Amino acid sequence: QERDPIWVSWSNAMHSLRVGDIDAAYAEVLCAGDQHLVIKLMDKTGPSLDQMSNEIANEALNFISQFLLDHSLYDICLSWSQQLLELVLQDGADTFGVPMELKTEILYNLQDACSTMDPPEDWEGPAPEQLVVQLASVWEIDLQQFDK
């Protein structure tokens, strides 16, 4: 008889949040494997790329890239994408040290979501097409070179 280890991880993460260590909270949950706990954490904190190390930001963006393929997570993905754009505009295109492959996956997956799903009902940010056009520009990726 022992607790599911994911809840011990969650407890460690909640303590980290209590003391303001968002980076450590993410490091714990992103490592615990469990997708539903990653979503649970993101739902609680909101977009948190401004409080993360490059290493943890890259782990989080890897999840966002995968989440973009799921229409139930579109709101979350747009919110994080918007924050990412704002931060790369402010702190520099390469501030987070995201590799070109991941940059490309994020754009490709966001463009795909944009093409197939409608903006969530409560979404109030830029049109999804504006996010992907602007992010592609900052990252110097030509969206029209993706094949249709």
Author numbering: 717 to 864
Question: How did the manuscript describe this experimental structure?
Answer:
The molecular mechanism underlying this microtubule array reorientation involves katanin, a microtubule severing enzyme, and a plant-specific microtubule associated protein called SPIRAL2. Upon severing, SPIRAL2 binds nascent microtubule minus ends and limits their dynamics, thereby stabilizing the longitudinal array while the lateral array undergoes net depolymerization. The domain architecture of SPR2 family members is distinct from CAMSAP proteins, as the former contains a predicted N-terminal TOG domain, a central coiled-coil, and a helical C-terminal domain of unknown structure. To gain insight into SPIRAL2 structure and function, we determined a 1.8 Å resolution crystal structure of the Arabidopsis thaliana SPIRAL2 C-terminal domain.
